[PDB]
Design a protein around this motif. Structure first.
Motif, PDB file in Angstrom:
ATOM      1  N   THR A 113       0.855  -1.182   0.000  1.00  0.00           N
ATOM      2  CA  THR A 113       0.000   0.000   0.000  1.00  0.00           C
ATOM      3  C   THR A 113       0.893   1.235   0.000  1.00  0.00           C
ATOM      4  O   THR A 113       2.050   1.169   0.412  1.00  0.00           O
ATOM      5  CB  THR A 113      -0.904   0.056   1.255  1.00  0.00           C
ATOM      6  N   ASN A 114       0.360   2.357  -0.465  1.00  0.00           N
ATOM      7  CA  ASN A 114       1.134   3.586  -0.486  1.00  0.00           C
ATOM      8  C   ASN A 114       1.493   3.927   0.959  1.00  0.00           C
ATOM      9  O   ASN A 114       2.574   4.445   1.233  1.00  0.00           O
ATOM     10  CB  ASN A 114       0.319   4.722  -1.103  1.00  0.00           C
ATOM     11  N   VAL A 134       4.770   7.427  -7.476  1.00  0.00           N
ATOM     12  CA  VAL A 134       3.372   7.086  -7.322  1.00  0.00           C
ATOM     13  C   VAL A 134       2.910   6.378  -8.585  1.00  0.00           C
ATOM     14  O   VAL A 134       3.012   6.921  -9.683  1.00  0.00           O
ATOM     15  CB  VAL A 134       2.516   8.343  -7.097  1.00  0.00           C
ATOM     16  N   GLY A 135       2.410   5.160  -8.422  1.00  0.00           N
ATOM     17  CA  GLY A 135       1.944   4.395  -9.560  1.00  0.00           C
ATOM     18  C   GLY A 135       2.410   2.953  -9.499  1.00  0.00           C
ATOM     19  O   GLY A 135       3.281   2.599  -8.703  1.00  0.00           O
ATOM     20  N   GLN A 139      -8.993  -0.125 -10.581  1.00  0.00           N
ATOM     21  CA  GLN A 139      -7.657   0.250 -10.138  1.00  0.00           C
ATOM     22  C   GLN A 139      -7.673   1.463  -9.210  1.00  0.00           C
ATOM     23  O   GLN A 139      -8.322   1.451  -8.162  1.00  0.00           O
ATOM     24  CB  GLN A 139      -6.745   0.513 -11.350  1.00  0.00           C
ATOM     25  N   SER A 140      -6.955   2.509  -9.596  1.00  0.00           N
ATOM     26  CA  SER A 140      -6.888   3.711  -8.786  1.00  0.00           C
ATOM     27  C   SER A 140      -7.361   4.942  -9.540  1.00  0.00           C
ATOM     28  O   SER A 140      -6.931   5.196 -10.667  1.00  0.00           O
ATOM     29  CB  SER A 140      -5.458   3.919  -8.293  1.00  0.00           C
ATOM     30  N   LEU A 145      -3.672  11.608  -6.117  1.00  0.00           N
ATOM     31  CA  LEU A 145      -3.399  12.839  -5.409  1.00  0.00           C
ATOM     32  C   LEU A 145      -3.154  12.566  -3.942  1.00  0.00           C
ATOM     33  O   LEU A 145      -2.304  13.197  -3.311  1.00  0.00           O
ATOM     34  CB  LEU A 145      -4.575  13.795  -5.553  1.00  0.00           C
ATOM     35  N   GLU A 146      -3.908  11.618  -3.399  1.00  0.00           N
ATOM     36  CA  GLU A 146      -3.784  11.260  -1.994  1.00  0.00           C
ATOM     37  C   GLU A 146      -2.409  10.657  -1.736  1.00  0.00           C
ATOM     38  O   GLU A 146      -1.744  11.007  -0.760  1.00  0.00           O
ATOM     39  CB  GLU A 146      -4.890  10.274  -1.610  1.00  0.00           C
ATOM     40  N   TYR A 147      -1.976   9.763  -2.617  1.00  0.00           N
ATOM     41  CA  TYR A 147      -0.672   9.144  -2.458  1.00  0.00           C
ATOM     42  C   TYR A 147       0.444  10.182  -2.547  1.00  0.00           C
ATOM     43  O   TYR A 147       1.438  10.089  -1.838  1.00  0.00           O
ATOM     44  CB  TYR A 147      -0.470   8.066  -3.517  1.00  0.00           C
ATOM     45  N   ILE A 148       0.278  11.172  -3.415  1.00  0.00           N
ATOM     46  CA  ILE A 148       1.283  12.215  -3.571  1.00  0.00           C
ATOM     47  C   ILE A 148       1.414  13.018  -2.275  1.00  0.00           C
ATOM     48  O   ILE A 148       2.521  13.193  -1.759  1.00  0.00           O
ATOM     49  CB  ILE A 148       0.920  13.128  -4.757  1.00  0.00           C
TER      50      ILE A 148
END
Length: 225
Positions: A113-114, A134-135, A139-140, A145-148
């Motif tokens: 997970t991120n 990120v990637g 899927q996603s 944006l949240e992961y960033i």
């Protein structure tokens, strides 16, 4: 003299308008020749995925880069490879041995997970400047944006990503904190057109060292104006 009016570019050391080239296993002499000829326009060189492990002249490559004021790091897949085998400490000792200032942390292959990825960013951030990605290589929605943001909160110097996500980012996140992969002319010109001459780009092939700079300066048709 032969002067022209051209877009203002950042100078080394570049904190923005950075260009990250990818080394997929180039032979030493060609490597030195390429770096020597275009060093002013190269800020980082990423030794692709696990190629560094099979590179017998790694030390010389790194020395040539430091000598030309260029930062280096190993592909995030290398980090993931060691994580997959519970040998994160070896990875740490590996990056420290070669004198890494930067390191890449990603979760594009290893199911992670991120959030878990962010914990690794946090752990390494007190010893290295971290570039996260990120990637996935597979899927996603806008969880992107949240992961960033998550990565940034964890301590990522900059976030590497893969063009509408660009506009979505223009929601108060500093675009200068991001780096976009642009392995070809089409992607490079597009990012330069949307963000400007000082957009941060990665996965630039060695043969585009000079060519990319002409795109940033509008010295090629695609960005002429």
């Amino acid at each position: 003299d032969f002067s022209l009016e051209l877009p203002v570019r950042t100078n080394k050391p570049r904190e923005t308008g950075q260009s990250i080239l990818i080394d997929n296993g180039y032979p030493l002499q060609f490597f030195k020749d390429a770096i020597a000829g275009a060093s002013d326009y190269i800020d980082f060189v990423k030794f692709g995925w696990g190629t560094s492990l099979l590179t017998k002249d790694l030390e010389e490559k790194i020395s040539t880069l430091k000598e030309h004021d260029i930062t280096f790091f190993f592909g995030g897949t290398l980090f993931e490879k060691y994580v997959s085998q519970k040998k994160v400490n070896e990875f740490h000792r590996y990056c420290t041995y070669f004198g890494c200032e930067y390191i890449e942390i990603s979760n594009g292959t290893l199911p992670m997970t991120n959030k878990e990825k962010a914990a690794y960013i946090a752990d390494f951030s007190d010893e290295f400047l971290v570039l996260s990605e990120v990637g996935s290589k597979d899927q996603s929605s806008e969880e992107w944006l949240e992961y960033i943001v998550e990565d940034m909160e964890a301590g990522a110097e900059k976030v590497i990503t893969e063009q509408i996500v660009d506009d979505i980012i223009s929601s108060d996140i500093d675009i200068n904190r991001l780096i976009f992969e642009a392995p070809n002319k089409t992607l490079q010109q597009g990012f330069i057109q949307k963000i400007g001459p000082n957009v941060n780009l990665a996965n630039i092939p060695f043969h585009d060292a000079i060519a990319l700079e002409t795109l940033r300066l509008g010295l090629r048709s695609d960005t002429f104006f």
